[PDB]
Design an enzyme around this catalytic site. Sequence first.
Site, PDB file in Angstrom:
ATOM      1  CD  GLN A 119      -1.332 -90.864 -89.043  1.00  0.00           C
ATOM      2  OE1 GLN A 119      -2.143 -91.499 -89.739  1.00  0.00           O
ATOM      3  NE2 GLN A 119      -0.962 -91.252 -87.827  1.00  0.00           N
ATOM      4  CG  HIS A 178      -1.780 -93.901 -93.436  1.00  0.00           C
ATOM      5  ND1 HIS A 178      -2.447 -95.094 -93.229  1.00  0.00           N
ATOM      6  CD2 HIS A 178      -1.903 -93.194 -92.321  1.00  0.00           C
ATOM      7  CE1 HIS A 178      -2.963 -95.089 -92.010  1.00  0.00           C
ATOM      8  NE2 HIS A 178      -2.647 -93.948 -91.418  1.00  0.00           N
ATOM      9  CD  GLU A 204      -7.628 -88.163 -92.224  1.00  0.00           C
ATOM     10  OE1 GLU A 204      -8.172 -89.198 -91.781  1.00  0.00           O
ATOM     11  OE2 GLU A 204      -6.528 -88.198 -92.817  1.00  0.00           O
ATOM     12  CG  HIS A 205      -5.762 -86.804 -88.529  1.00  0.00           C
ATOM     13  ND1 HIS A 205      -5.405 -87.591 -89.600  1.00  0.00           N
ATOM     14  CD2 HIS A 205      -6.634 -87.520 -87.791  1.00  0.00           C
ATOM     15  CE1 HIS A 205      -6.072 -88.741 -89.514  1.00  0.00           C
ATOM     16  NE2 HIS A 205      -6.816 -88.722 -88.427  1.00  0.00           N
ATOM     17  CG  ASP A 263      -4.771 -92.891 -86.871  1.00  0.00           C
ATOM     18  OD1 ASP A 263      -5.560 -91.964 -87.188  1.00  0.00           O
ATOM     19  OD2 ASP A 263      -3.607 -92.982 -87.311  1.00  0.00           O
ATOM     20  CG  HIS A 273     -48.437 -74.642-105.133  1.00  0.00           C
ATOM     21  ND1 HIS A 273     -48.215 -75.247-106.357  1.00  0.00           N
ATOM     22  CD2 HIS A 273     -47.450 -75.032-104.324  1.00  0.00           C
ATOM     23  CE1 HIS A 273     -47.101 -75.976-106.256  1.00  0.00           C
ATOM     24  NE2 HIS A 273     -46.638 -75.866-105.024  1.00  0.00           N
TER      25      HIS A 273
HETATM   26  N1  LIG Z   1      -9.506 -90.538 -94.477  1.00  0.00           N
HETATM   27  C1  LIG Z   1      -9.496 -91.476 -93.535  1.00  0.00           C
HETATM   28  O1  LIG Z   1     -10.160 -91.326 -92.499  1.00  0.00           O
HETATM   29  C2  LIG Z   1      -8.684 -92.723 -93.663  1.00  0.00           C
HETATM   30  C3  LIG Z   1      -7.966 -92.983 -94.793  1.00  0.00           C
HETATM   31  N2  LIG Z   1      -7.194 -94.108 -94.922  1.00  0.00           N
HETATM   32  C4  LIG Z   1      -6.477 -94.350 -96.198  1.00  0.00           C
HETATM   33  O2  LIG Z   1      -6.986 -95.524 -96.793  1.00  0.00           O
HETATM   34  C5  LIG Z   1      -6.012 -95.925 -97.789  1.00  0.00           C
HETATM   35  C6  LIG Z   1      -5.957 -97.428 -97.857  1.00  0.00           C
HETATM   36  O3  LIG Z   1      -5.443 -97.734 -99.166  1.00  0.00           O
HETATM   37  P1  LIG Z   1      -5.107 -99.230 -99.577  1.00  0.00           P
HETATM   38  O4  LIG Z   1      -4.100 -99.836 -98.677  1.00  0.00           O
HETATM   39  O5  LIG Z   1      -4.887 -99.188-101.044  1.00  0.00           O
HETATM   40  O6  LIG Z   1      -6.449-100.071 -99.322  1.00  0.00           O
HETATM   41  P2  LIG Z   1      -7.917 -99.989 -99.920  1.00  0.00           P
HETATM   42  O7  LIG Z   1      -8.722-101.048 -99.217  1.00  0.00           O
HETATM   43  O8  LIG Z   1      -8.370 -98.575 -99.952  1.00  0.00           O
HETATM   44  O9  LIG Z   1      -7.701-100.457-101.452  1.00  0.00           O
HETATM   45  C7  LIG Z   1      -7.494-101.830-101.818  1.00  0.00           C
HETATM   46  C8  LIG Z   1      -8.498-102.130-102.899  1.00  0.00           C
HETATM   47  O10 LIG Z   1      -8.327-101.142-103.946  1.00  0.00           O
HETATM   48  C9  LIG Z   1      -8.177-101.814-105.175  1.00  0.00           C
HETATM   49  N3  LIG Z   1      -7.302-101.067-106.069  1.00  0.00           N
HETATM   50  C10 LIG Z   1      -5.982-100.725-105.854  1.00  0.00           C
HETATM   51  N4  LIG Z   1      -5.422-100.122-106.877  1.00  0.00           N
HETATM   52  C11 LIG Z   1      -6.412-100.126-107.850  1.00  0.00           C
HETATM   53  C12 LIG Z   1      -6.441 -99.645-109.174  1.00  0.00           C
HETATM   54  N5  LIG Z   1      -5.400 -99.076-109.792  1.00  0.00           N
HETATM   55  N6  LIG Z   1      -7.601 -99.780-109.848  1.00  0.00           N
HETATM   56  C13 LIG Z   1      -8.646-100.342-109.231  1.00  0.00           C
HETATM   57  N7  LIG Z   1      -8.737-100.850-108.005  1.00  0.00           N
HETATM   58  C14 LIG Z   1      -7.573-100.707-107.360  1.00  0.00           C
HETATM   59  C15 LIG Z   1      -7.560-103.153-104.794  1.00  0.00           C
HETATM   60  O11 LIG Z   1      -7.610-104.112-105.827  1.00  0.00           O
HETATM   61  C16 LIG Z   1      -8.386-103.508-103.557  1.00  0.00           C
HETATM   62  O12 LIG Z   1      -9.670-104.042-103.862  1.00  0.00           O
HETATM   63  C17 LIG Z   1      -4.693 -95.227 -97.426  1.00  0.00           C
HETATM   64  O13 LIG Z   1      -4.381 -94.201 -98.360  1.00  0.00           O
HETATM   65  C18 LIG Z   1      -4.991 -94.657 -96.039  1.00  0.00           C
HETATM   66  O14 LIG Z   1      -4.265 -93.461 -95.738  1.00  0.00           O
HETATM   67  C19 LIG Z   1      -7.106 -95.046 -93.894  1.00  0.00           C
HETATM   68  C20 LIG Z   1      -7.855 -94.930 -92.811  1.00  0.00           C
HETATM   69  C21 LIG Z   1      -8.693 -93.759 -92.605  1.00  0.00           C
HETATM   70  N1  LIG Z   2     -43.271 -77.837-103.640  1.00  0.00           N
HETATM   71  C1  LIG Z   2     -41.941 -77.284-103.795  1.00  0.00           C
HETATM   72  C2  LIG Z   2     -41.760 -75.933-103.055  1.00  0.00           C
HETATM   73  S1  LIG Z   2     -42.435 -74.587-104.050  1.00  0.00           S
HETATM   74  O1  LIG Z   2     -43.828 -74.901-104.373  1.00  0.00           O
HETATM   75  O2  LIG Z   2     -41.628 -74.415-105.296  1.00  0.00           O
HETATM   76  O3  LIG Z   2     -42.414 -73.341-103.248  1.00  0.00           O
HETATM   77  C3  LIG Z   2     -41.030 -78.350-103.218  1.00  0.00           C
HETATM   78  O4  LIG Z   2     -40.851 -79.357-103.870  1.00  0.00           O
HETATM   79  O5  LIG Z   2     -40.568 -78.187-102.117  1.00  0.00           O
HETATM   80  N1  LIG Z   3      -4.753 -92.347 -89.864  1.00  0.00           N
HETATM   81  C1  LIG Z   3      -5.872 -92.996 -90.507  1.00  0.00           C
HETATM   82  C2  LIG Z   3      -6.496 -94.001 -89.556  1.00  0.00           C
HETATM   83  S1  LIG Z   3      -5.594 -95.573 -89.503  1.00  0.00           S
HETATM   84  O1  LIG Z   3      -4.218 -95.283 -89.171  1.00  0.00           O
HETATM   85  O2  LIG Z   3      -5.680 -96.216 -90.795  1.00  0.00           O
HETATM   86  O3  LIG Z   3      -6.174 -96.426 -88.471  1.00  0.00           O
HETATM   87  C3  LIG Z   3      -6.883 -91.922 -90.918  1.00  0.00           C
HETATM   88  O4  LIG Z   3      -6.637 -91.198 -91.880  1.00  0.00           O
HETATM   89  O5  LIG Z   3      -7.861 -91.769 -90.220  1.00  0.00           O
HETATM   90 ZN   LIG Z   4      -3.056 -93.434 -89.392  1.00  0.00          ZN
HETATM   91 ZN   LIG Z   5     -44.892 -76.823-104.423  1.00  0.00          ZN
END
Ligand SMILES: NC(=O)C1=CN([C@@H]2O[C@H](COP(=O)(O)OP(=O)(O)OC[C@H]3O[C@@H](n4cnc5c(N)ncnc54)[C@H](O)[C@@H]3O)[C@@H](O)[C@H]2O)C=CC1
Ligand SMILES: N[C@@H](CS(=O)(=O)O)C(=O)O
Ligand SMILES: N[C@@H](CS(=O)(=O)O)C(=O)O
Ligand SMILES: [Zn+2]
Ligand SMILES: [Zn+2]
Lengths: 436, 435
Positions: free
Chosen positions: A248, A251, A318-319, A352, A411
């Site tokens: 990982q 990445h 995350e993992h 993944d 109310h």
């Molecule tokens: N949390 C999760 O479940 C998962 C997370 N990931 C993460 O996703 C990420 C993928 O990153 P990338 O390869 O960059 O692809 P991405 O698709 O996230 O980013 C590419 C895009 O970001 C824009 N970008 C890049 N730098 C920029 C900047 N400085 N300002 C504005 N826009 C910018 C690019 O121009 C493009 O449009 C990795 O960090 C990976 O670990 C991947 C899969 C799952």
């Molecule tokens: N009507 C309110 C609840 S209360 O009347 O403040 O008890 C709401 O938007 O859920």
């Molecule tokens: N390890 C990535 C998934 S992938 O490897 O990009 O397919 C995640 O953070 O979930």
């Molecule tokens: Zn991965």
């Molecule tokens: Zn109310």
Amino acid sequence: MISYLKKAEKTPQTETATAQKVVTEMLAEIQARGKDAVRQYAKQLDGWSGDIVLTPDQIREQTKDVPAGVRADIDFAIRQVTDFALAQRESLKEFSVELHPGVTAGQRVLPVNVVGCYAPAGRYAHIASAYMGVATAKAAGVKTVVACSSPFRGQGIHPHVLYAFQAAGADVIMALGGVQAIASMAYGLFTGKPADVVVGPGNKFVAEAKRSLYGQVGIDVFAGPSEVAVIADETADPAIVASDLVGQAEHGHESPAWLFTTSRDLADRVMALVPELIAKLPPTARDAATAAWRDYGEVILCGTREEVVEISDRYASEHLEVHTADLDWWLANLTCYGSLFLGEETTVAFGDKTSGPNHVLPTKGAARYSGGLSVHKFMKTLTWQQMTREATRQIGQVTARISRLEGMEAHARTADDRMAKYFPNASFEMGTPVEV
Amino acid sequence: ISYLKKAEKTPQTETATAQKVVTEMLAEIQARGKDAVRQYAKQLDGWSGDIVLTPDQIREQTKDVPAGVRADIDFAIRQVTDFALAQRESLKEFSVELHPGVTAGQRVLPVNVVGCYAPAGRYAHIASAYMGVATAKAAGVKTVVACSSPFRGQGIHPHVLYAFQAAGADVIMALGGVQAIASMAYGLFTGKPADVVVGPGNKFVAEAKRSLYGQVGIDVFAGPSEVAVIADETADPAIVASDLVGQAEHGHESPAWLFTTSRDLADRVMALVPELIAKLPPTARDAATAAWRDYGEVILCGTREEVVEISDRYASEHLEVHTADLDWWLANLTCYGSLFLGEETTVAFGDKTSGPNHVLPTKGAARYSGGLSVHKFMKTLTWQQMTREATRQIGQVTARISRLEGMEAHARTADDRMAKYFPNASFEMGTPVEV
Ligand SMILES: NC(=O)C1=CN([C@@H]2O[C@H](COP(=O)(O)OP(=O)(O)OC[C@H]3O[C@@H](n4cnc5c(N)ncnc54)[C@H](O)[C@@H]3O)[C@@H](O)[C@H]2O)C=CC1
Ligand SMILES: N[C@@H](CS(=O)(=O)O)C(=O)O
Ligand SMILES: N[C@@H](CS(=O)(=O)O)C(=O)O
Ligand SMILES: [Zn+2]
Ligand SMILES: [Zn+2]
Ligand SMILES: NC(=O)C1=CN([C@@H]2O[C@H](COP(=O)(O)OP(=O)(O)OC[C@H]3O[C@@H](n4cnc5c(N)ncnc54)[C@H](O)[C@@H]3O)[C@@H](O)[C@H]2O)C=CC1
């Protein structure tokens, strides 16, 4: 006492300010200028001046040469994700219950109308991310799925990403990356179909854009740069542990890899091996992983299992892989992680790509309060109620009294009006009317 | 489809005002922490005292709350708890076999710390105080922190305080508004940062929670109260009008919407609403007059299907249905926070004591979420475990897809298992990545 054998200079929080500054500027431009700003960013950031929405015919043309063996692998993975998604769907039930006599209350579970799915493409092309979002949305019964992935390596959407989106069931596909993709899906630019929920993983900018747009849309979870943690005891194999951390770390420069162990020998061998494994990687991965391990990698030695649980829960990775004896105990005792890998045989990379459970998962501590993308993120759990007239005798007088205590006369009058209509002869205490 | 009454303003109108104040206040609290919060509490709410209440203070401040009041609040807490426990039963853990030898499952676990806000400004929200805390306790959350605004230049309203205490709050703070939401998110004054922050409030409160999402989880965007009524020719205009006015009194920004297929009903309601408002006491009369004038709307539709389309687009916090054939409406409506089927129940019943939570999505958030519930306090996490046999298929697919993506280190974790577990096996693991 817990010993850091390797302490990181940086954490998932370090780059927050950098991401926020860019996203603030870009979302302001897009809110002001719409498609004009999005086309600008597509050109300036991604070099793209083509059309953004793909026609059904372009999708066919762009995937016509994807080989049978590649299709078979992606199809298998889609089936695994669908199978698990359908099991998750069955786990949340509709119901109705009687509360106070004559009060019926229930829960309806309904899919959202429109979902936008992002699949990243930048350092790597995220073929698996492409089916993680779309296949889950289709399993949940969402009728309109819009999918975006960044133009990749001078062409449009990576053909295998596009095949994944199409095979998984996307209704609309856009060649569009980053913040501009997230924003476009949130506002319905190009399609006229604003999303109800936007999902999918990405870099710190993508993740911050989704977080900032929450409210305009629902989201799955904050899903930013990948993280991996391994819990290991003396039974674990250091070569496999090291391999899984490096897996990982490739990445990107900001991906943390964390080792929590009760074995000093394991820690030592892993710290020796990780640099050796990184050095044997090809250039892109070696560049990413060298920086990630140096800046964000940590190795923590603990005395007892209870101490490991405490630290693991605070990191909220995350993992989380668990390479220990007595795996039942860890499953029972760990509480903060995105996705758990029990035993050495499974591993994050399996999750993944094809195990089944979704890979789109919380980072930067979001596992303290959410799991990952699932069918649950596409269902609304709404409540309904219905009463007999008789139920309103109790419910109405309690409502009128509490309302008046709060100062809410109007109310209380809705309760008074029902009591007078349904039970003109009743004389309950409805509370002193509000005068101010 | 025809507007008989069209609003000048919507829930969107005041967004910029809210966001400006919230951005400034959050920036200040991030810089100066407790001191920024104490200063905001003094300037906004007139408060100079201690923020965290002690157990003695809580007891002293609630000592004169009468038995009759306690009995009503206790009853309402029981209804909320009963429905919460029913909701909790609706989400199950499970495990399943996927590819042979692959086991995967779902764990359902409560969060550790919840922060609950109960508003107090125009009114004192006694019911809001138990809606958050009772639900968190029903979910099995171990630590619940509760805040409500110092009320009218004094402390927490004593009945709000009683509600928090009886519902099971672990810590209570006299703190209002943006500074309350920020303090609970960051763990100011308690040292216990929240995992999830919940509860309703004005546009500033709701925006603060929306902004702090990420630092914390939240329930839902729960801003100024909204009410919608669907009515056909069988509806009683006096009751429809009453129900609209009931939530209009919440404040100048509260929309009241009527969707109907009956012009007669629409006309009678538009005549009655002003008359009912005129009969309210001063504070409510002021709120509801402005709310109805500025945000109130009446829409006449030709068919039930048109009503469904419009209702779904409005996605109201609360939706009452005064029609024939209620089964059809339950089956066909899809975007609302909480549904009230038939004339007998009504929004105020749901507000105080029906059972289902009143903390509900506003400003169109019902397009993607229901309200506060135990489900907002449960994490649904996944786990998996494999046999070595399972890794033969899973591993080769992983290695191939990884290499197609350009992820060589990912593939190597598969290669490594294959070499360890099955040293004589030979599989297509994909062409190694060279860039
Ligand atoms: N949390 C999760 O479940 C998962 C997370 N990931 C993460 O996703 C990420 C993928 O990153 P990338 O390869 O960059 O692809 P991405 O698709 O996230 O980013 C590419 C895009 O970001 C824009 N970008 C890049 N730098 C920029 C900047 N400085 N300002 C504005 N826009 C910018 C690019 O121009 C493009 O449009 C990795 O960090 C990976 O670990 C991947 C899969 C799952
Ligand atoms: N009507 C309110 C609840 S209360 O009347 O403040 O008890 C709401 O938007 O859920
Ligand atoms: N390890 C990535 C998934 S992938 O490897 O990009 O397919 C995640 O953070 O979930
Ligand atoms: Zn991965
Ligand atoms: Zn109310
Ligand atoms: N969506 C839902 O489920 C529910 C919504 N509500 C809504 O909650 C709201 C309660 O509003 P309030 O009476 O104001 O109580 P509140 O508790 O939300 O607001 C009072 C706090 O806001 C601060 N504040 C007020 N104006 C400010 C300003 N201009 N700048 C900074 N801080 C400011 C006050 O100093 C105080 O700390 C109503 O609109 C009601 O309709 C109530 C219950 C449930």
